[PDB]
């Protein structure tokens, strides 16, 4: 250390031997923390908070865990950031990306101990990932021409995604709900059109998807409670003292009877607007704002249903289901399109009462009712079902799939191995380490179940080298099998994102050799 000081008090510097030490300790720390939640037989963690008023949640997702953990190592924050982005991109594989990105760094520290310059490893890995992604592409199978065959693939993808979650207790029941829900969107990737309503009580198997729609609102007082063959007008306008006349006007009169005259003119304005609404020949009215008690009785005298305070989400969803138009100014009744549902009634679920729409016109949106025993099950069920809906929506956008259960990893690990046997130099060593990292992912799945991982992986390595490119693990019995027969299937887009993102982070971390920290701010709260 130079005798002269260059840093202010509290600032610290770390260099080559210490910098690479700290960065590797952090990465493997986060990788080993989440390995327990991987595969069809991983277990779940408990997150309890000291700051957020002792909030408690039970989860298996690898991205939810990494968001709540308060990491402070600079290198560990890079790993958390990729997992959050991956969740917002395809919605699955958050656990696989971080484990793989951590296993690459575990092999990278051993190579440095053998006196190989870091730039040599990166150039070596860059060739390894190119040959790995190309081999994956040649493994893709693309359906979509046959509805019957494509329908089978959607059931296989949804069945695999739900395996590692709590929904595996009822996988058959929950596979049908997830698939049929996505077929309603008619190819539009608006996932917000699916409203998952979760309310406590009853068994987890009582959950279902409603054939129509459900609204958790309340109708006006002294209005019909149920209508057959309804015509719906969807509006976004003011009705509680709509007289917000944008100007800065004011009333200046010299008597009292003038005020009582102007006051009566206010009600005439509201009454006239109501008549123009009823001119459309509607029998159901939906508004996104409040409804005052004076216009409430106008509908109550005319025999109409008025729903109030259905926010932007509640209105846009109704537009897709019934096909109406969100209208305002009510001046041209011919140009506005109304909705149509066969029946509207009030239903009771648990304790609450919700509005039931049945026999809708379009049905391009839906609602899902979830039941359960604890708030932890309801949250876990909803979060698990989010993974299934997203990955299915990506499949419809790009309908090419790749086999899973370790069949995919072993194929790419072999393609890099063949390349490393022709390349001279120290780059050959680095490429082999890439194959050691990919093959760990099938190993970790076997370890969690209590099987001889070394024996099973050894059989897979031989099977894939001799041309049986569909071999892979079978969890229910701990032997080998064919995926074309069993049906374990992933998405090409999901696996591609897992491979490319993971290989990048081990590149950005590995190029770092100096760590510098500014003197932290002190806690002096308000």
């Amino acid at each position: 250390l130079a005798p002269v000081n260059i840093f202010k008090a509290g600032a610290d510097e770390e260099r080559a031997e210490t910098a690479r030490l700290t960065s590797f300790i952090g990465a493997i720390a986060i990788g080993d923390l989440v390995k327990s939640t991987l595969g069809p037989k991983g277990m779940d963690k408990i997150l309890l908070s000291s700051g957020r008023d002792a909030s408690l949640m039970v989860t298996n997702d690898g991205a939810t865990i990494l968001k709540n953990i308060g990491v402070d190592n600079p290198a560990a924050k890079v790993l958390v950031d990729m997992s959050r982005v991956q969740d917002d991109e395809v919605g699955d594989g958050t656990t696989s990306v971080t484990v793989l990105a951590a296993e690459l760094l575990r092999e990278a520290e051993s190579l440095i101990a053998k006196k190989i310059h870091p730039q040599t490893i990166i150039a070596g890995w860059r060739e390894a990932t190119k040959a790995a992604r190309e081999a994956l592409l040649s493994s893709a199978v693309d359906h979509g021409s046959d509805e019957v065959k494509f329908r089978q693939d959607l059931m296989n993808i949804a069945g695999t995604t739900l395996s590692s979650k709590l929904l595996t207790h009822h996988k058959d029941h929950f596979t049908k709900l997830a698939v049929e829900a996505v077929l309603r969107l008619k190819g539009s990737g608006n996932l917000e059109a699916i409203h998952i309503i979760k309310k406590l009580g009853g068994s987890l198997a009582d959950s279902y998807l409603d054939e129509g729609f459900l609204l958790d609102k309340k109708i006006g007082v002294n209005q019909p409670k149920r209508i057959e063959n309804a015509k719906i007008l969807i509006a976004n306008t003011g009705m509680d003292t709509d007289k917000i006349k944008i100007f800065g006007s004011r009333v200046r009169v010299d008597s009292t009877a003038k005020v009582a005259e102007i006051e009566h003119a206010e009600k005439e304005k509201m009454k006239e607007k109501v008549e123009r609404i009823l001119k459309h020949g509607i029998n159901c009215f939906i508004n996104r704002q409040l409804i005052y008690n004076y216009p409430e009785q106008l509908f109550g005298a005319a025999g109409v249903m008025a729903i109030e305070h259905a926010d932007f989400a509640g209105v846009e969803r109704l537009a897709l289901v019934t096909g109406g138009e969100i209208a305002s100014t009510f001046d041209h009744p011919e140009l506005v399109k109304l909705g149509s549902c066969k029946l509207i009634e009030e239903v009771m679920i648990g304790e609450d009462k919700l509005i039931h729409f049945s026999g809708v016109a379009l049905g391009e949106a839906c609602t899902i009712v979830l039941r359960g025993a604890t708030q932890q099950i309801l949250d876990e069920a909803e979060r698990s079902l989010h993974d299934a809906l997203c990955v299915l929506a990506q499949t419809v956008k790009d309908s090419r799939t790749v086999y899973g259960g370790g069949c995919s990893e072993m194929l790419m690990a072999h393609a890099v191995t063949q390349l490393a046997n022709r390349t001279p130099g120290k780059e050959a060593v680095a490429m082999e380490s890439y194959a050691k990292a990919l093959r760990m992912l099938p190993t970790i799945i076997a370890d969690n179940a209590g099987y001889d991982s070394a024996d099973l992986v050894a059989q897979l390595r031989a099977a894939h080298s001799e041309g049986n490119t569909t071999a892979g693990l079978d969890m229910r019995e701990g032997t080998i099998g064919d995926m074309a027969i069993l049906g374990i299937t992933e998405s090409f887009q999901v696996k591609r994102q897992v491979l490319l993102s993971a290989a990048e982070a081990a590149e950005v971390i590995l190029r770092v050799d100096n760590i510098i920290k500014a003197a932290p701010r002190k806690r002096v709260p308000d």
Binding site: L33, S36, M43, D44, K45, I46, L47, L48, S49, S50, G51, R52, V58, N60, I65, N68, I69, G70, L166, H169, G202, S203, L204, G372, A373, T374, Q376, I377
Partner: protein, 77 residues
């Protein structure tokens, strides 16, 4: 056993008598606090709806199956 304990009886003796009497015939036999022993229950006009027993059992097993999936505890913010 818990009901036979709160009433000041011998829990081992009562449950042994109960399991004996349910395995050779009647199924309505139960604890009788007023008499202090075991007798036919429907003669005492004590009943309860079926949904209470079914729902209690179903919610219990669903929770226990959820507990066994837990493996680790960590502290967050």
């Amino acid at each position: 056993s818990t009901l036979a304990e709160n009433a000041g009886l011998n829990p081992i003796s009562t449950v042994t008598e109960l399991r004996n009497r349910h395995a050779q015939g009647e199924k309505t036999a139960g604890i009788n606090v007023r008499k202090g022993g075991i007798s036919n229950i429907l003669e005492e006009l004590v009943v309860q709806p079926l949904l209470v027993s079914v729902s209690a059992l179903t919610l219990a097993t669903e929770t226990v199956r959820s507990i066994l999936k837990i493996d680790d505890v960590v502290n967050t913010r």
